[PDB]
Ligand binder design. Structure first.
Ligand SMILES: [Cl-]
Ligand SMILES: [Cl-]
Ligand SMILES: [Cl-]
Ligand SMILES: [Cl-]
Ligand SMILES: [Gd+3]
Ligand SMILES: [Gd+3]
Ligand SMILES: [Gd+3]
Ligand SMILES: [Gd+3]
Lengths: 244, 241, 244, 241
């Protein structure tokens, strides 16, 4: 029973639930379903639900997900990838959405910035959510985890040295693999904003656009003000409110 | 959306749903949540939702699950174990129950016979469902599967280490489960079901060293429909008082 | 070098060769290639090359193969199946034929009786030899090995009790599996004789015909005099000389 | 029939054949039989028959083999190991050599560099080819493969036990080989090829406890084409006197 999944935490009036390691907020509404994914917080800061304020006064159904809870010593998530390096966490998110949402999937919108944008893409491309509106995702996920936390990277690489570089490249290509194996016949509605001052994620955006190009999948991209900062976020929020 | 998960099949007036290859019936009631798991049908017979007749005229919330849809050559299920031999299928079942149930887990009852009883044990021990009322479950899964289908076991094998991993898959659940849960496990078995009486003693040994005391009962019949008749009377008696 | 593969044995003037555990005779000729497989000899009798006499005065190319050399305590062969229960022995036979034969495959003819007929079928259906002319093959190979040698069966079943019945049914269906996975688009030229007094192998022939029927593969079958004996063989030899 | 095995490809006037997915060149000569094995080409380059230029103007019998045709994503070969990780491919090579060679095995010479040298060792140690003249072979196969292609290693893995089985696949050949054969194994390695000098010491340790004394020689270069130049001079010197 949903109410028995509560953690005791409360975010802006919304009670937190946890199912099979997946923490989420749920507000039942009408017309549309809005789904958000959390990005990396700073070290020693708890993972935060993204873009609640934009939607708690809305009448839409709202689900906001956090990343995983491991590793314990730097519990800022593993890019929505299980420690078995598979889809078990994305699958849990998918089940929660399909059972708690009261709209069609084409009336479902996936939102997220940076790591959250990758999460939205990973879920949408695995389980055919066509509406993905994100900002500045990474392309090579392991290269980026390395810059944010050596602890999270080391944990995800595993303990055996035989497989560390294997796991590294596997994680590094996890999203790119999702693009290559996704259903090219779906009417994808993917928008990716990026700050014009964000040289890194501008390059990552070219890598992603290239993979979508190879799959004959047209993507909408819009450059916006800012870098990897709150000015880009501010323009991103304005962008996805216009669409939705 | 749940209504978008309908397969178009209807079983006894109950619509069928499917999420992540997991097919289930769902009927919202009150008071209690009853969960059933499918057992092995005969070789060329489709998988059946078990004990639906016992609970269509009841006011309880009811969920009946089928096993997996593979292998295609013999689609009778892989003991609720994925092709990767992990918890992926039990994960989906757990998510379906937790989000569709309108009762507490202590008011939830897992039911099943033979392979259906293993499924109930696999789910309950993994995700702390205390009420498990089953009949004649197997303990060594691969040993039983090969007597029912060489096709399914070989598909699940992908050879030696896989055999032991499947064979002990339920015993490992017992070894791993939460000893401090107030377990309410009832296991019946036919008087004449010698194979599964021994299987029950193998399961009891694992429960025993985990300090889990289960309830058992001999009923008439073998590994047959006579036993299932008395099993059904047993779980109706337990659930209603 | 072929001459360095000799065993020192000599059968009717033909020197025996052995390559990777596979014993064979080879006489180079013209026009056609004749390939024979050995059947079960009696216990404590060496495996025999089949139908040499019919072809040593012929001008055709001739290859005669024996079964495997294991188990050591009853070395009468394992139905041309390796002790890993795979195609490694058939593959060796195929290589020898493709390298020593000087005709096309449709001018190649596979001959054999009983166990040898199964060998011919196993090779022909794995590697697309269309001309197969055999007598009284078995259908359920393990059931038949059980009647001939408990020692060979036990050896092929392996040592671990977990897999004995698995291996039994696997061997029992080895030829039937070959029929189901064979190329149905090949112009098969398969003739199967059987003695009218051979109730057992008449039933096995119905099982085989059924599998060929399911694959939409037409087979020629002819009932001949005798049982599982030298009268059936005698009529079988006459039959395959008429075709070739 | 051999002529029916032609692929239709021609390499430097030599027709290509294929038997059981094994692609080879064959040129009948006299006196000696020279066997070469292909090494890893770059990522998007087709597999090459090695050292064909050294032996087209020679009167020797010549066979050059490629590695396997899988995986399709990166078809540079699986170290002459089948997808089932067994001797199936070396079996076919052995059959081709034994039936097409017109010289004794003591007049047969296996050649190859890097992965090509492993292939020569795998064949020679399995089927008692005494003359092996190679450059800079690897000893831990999986450790090297992953630095050249994550795609090929993962295909070969199908994970942990497979890694060790592949990594030690050549070392097990040494452990299993015939100690009483009059082995004639020459292994060269570039002065500056530190990785493979250490790899050679790992191979030497296995030969050592099998009472097999090999011949080794430092040549100039690293794991590069400078070393291959001196390797080629070395095997021409050995073969001709
Ligand atoms: Cl981030
Ligand atoms: Cl069952
Ligand atoms: Cl026989
Ligand atoms: Cl190489
Ligand atoms: Gd435009
Ligand atoms: Gd513009
Ligand atoms: Gd007619
Ligand atoms: Gd007629």
């Amino acid at each position: 029973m949903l109410s028995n999944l509560k953690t005791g935490n409360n975010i802006l009036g919304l009670p937190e639930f946890e199912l099979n390691g997946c923490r989420f907020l749920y507000k039942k509404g009408i017309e549309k379903t809005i789904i958000t994914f959390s990005a990396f917080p700073p070290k020693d800061i708890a993972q935060k639900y993204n873009y609640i304020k934009d939607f708690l006064s809305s009448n839409y159904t709202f689900l906001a997900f956090l990343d995983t809870k491991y590793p314990e010593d730097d519990a800022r998530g593993t890019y929505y990838i299980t420690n078995e390096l598979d889809n078990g966490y994305l699958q849990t998110i998918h089940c929660i959405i399909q059972l708690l949402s009261n709209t069609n999937q084409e009336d479902t919108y996936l939102l997220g910035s940076s790591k959250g944008g990758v999460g939205a893409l990973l879920l949408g491309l695995t389980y055919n959510y066509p509406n993905i509106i994100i900002n500045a995702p990474q392309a090579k996920l392991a290269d980026y985890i390395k810059t944010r936390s050596k602890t999270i990277l080391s944990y995800m690489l595993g303990t055996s040295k035989r497989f560390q570089d294997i796991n590294y490249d596997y994680i590094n290509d996890f999203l790119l693999s999702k693009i290559k194996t996704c259903d090219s016949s779906l009417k994808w509605n993917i928008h990716i904003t990026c700050g014009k001052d964000d040289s890194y994620h501008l390059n990552e955006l070219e890598i992603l656009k290239n993979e979508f190009n190879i799959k004959a999948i047209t993507i909408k991209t819009k450059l916006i003000s800012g870098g990897h900062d709150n000015e880009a976020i501010a323009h991103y929020r304005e962008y996805f409110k216009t669409i939705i």
